[PDB]
Structure 1
């Protein structure tokens, strides 16, 4: 809750100032962080899915929800109901603590990190990025690997616009560019 305290003391004062909001509830806030791993190769075997949920459970200390196909498509050889991915929703303190370990540890552990994009905010403040490789998290041991995965992070916030989320993450010194 270190970053939640930093939000509550300095980010709110900053954004109320730089936007001239009438109310403090008018301020943006982060709501949830969603961690998907779309695993389309688990149709070969469940153990690949079973290991991706084990890896992502080490990243965020939650058991992941194994997602399935909403419908059936033949280009990917799937039927409605096949387990095809895994997700984790992070809220509250576990959200903040992951967001701390992210922007403090893992983003520096990216090979050839040179910034993010500010053009990934889906028109309505919610930011989405995707990592190529799970070893940037230090939870994962490098020898203890099975397969180089990749996942994607989706930060869902209460910002109406795109810039209010851009200012919120910049208030958390989020490495755009």
Structure 2
């Protein structure tokens, strides 16, 4: 919410002045943040998914979509349709809340945070960063932790290119080493 208002006025203002745009609609929004945990050990510990799911539920307040193996992959000993992961999509007020929480609490709390990347865009201005420790998030109690499973995060933006993606994120004060 707070970070959304900060966008709507200050970041939209600076982005318009920076890109020389004719329409406010032509500035990057953000679609969603999809938090993914490709557990891949559920085949070993079926329970380990409900515990990992319990953690995305913890970090972001949505029950997670427990996703299944799209097709059979024998190398990883997984068939088609087995629940080898769990994800959440955060969009809207809730996405803005989580985004604020991340940037203001967890991105500093990473182990000796030497910085984030600046190339982790698909090629149209959609960021994708992966965190190596679940503990960085405040929500975790460590009173209910099995292991130190990290996760990744995709900031899906309506941006046109990687330049607009970087512009939008840096505008939000992303560390961006």
The two structures have a TM-score, normalised by structure 1, of 0.98
Gaps of 5+ in 2: none
Deviation at 1:145, TM superposition (A): 1.2
CA distance in 1, matches of 2:107, 2:41: 27
CA distance in 1, matches of 2:147, 2:53: 13
Deviation at 1:86, TM superposition (A): 0.5
The two structures have a TM-score, normalised by structure 2, of 0.98
Structure with bigger strand share is 1
Q: Deviations over 1:15-51 (max 9, x none)?
A: 1111111111001111100000001111012110010
Per the alignment, in what secondary structure is the counterpart of residue 83 of structure 1?
A: coil
Deviation at 1:148, TM superposition (A): 1.0
Per the alignment, in what secondary structure is the counterpart of residue 156 of structure 1?
A: strand
Deviation at 1:143, TM superposition (A): 3.5
Q: Deviations over 1:104-140 (max 9, x none)?
A: 0001110110111101111110000101110001110
Instruction: Provide the alpha-carbon RMSD of the alignment.
Output: 0.7
CA distance in 2, matches of 1:41, 1:164: 37
Gaps of 5+ in 1: none
CA distance in 1, matches of 2:21, 2:141: 46
Deviation at 1:98, TM superposition (A): 0.3
Deviation at 1:78, TM superposition (A): 0.8
Which residue of structure 2 aligns with residue 48 of structure 1? 48
Per the alignment, in what secondary structure is the counterpart of residue 119 of structure 2?
A: coil
Deviation at 1:144, TM superposition (A): 2.4
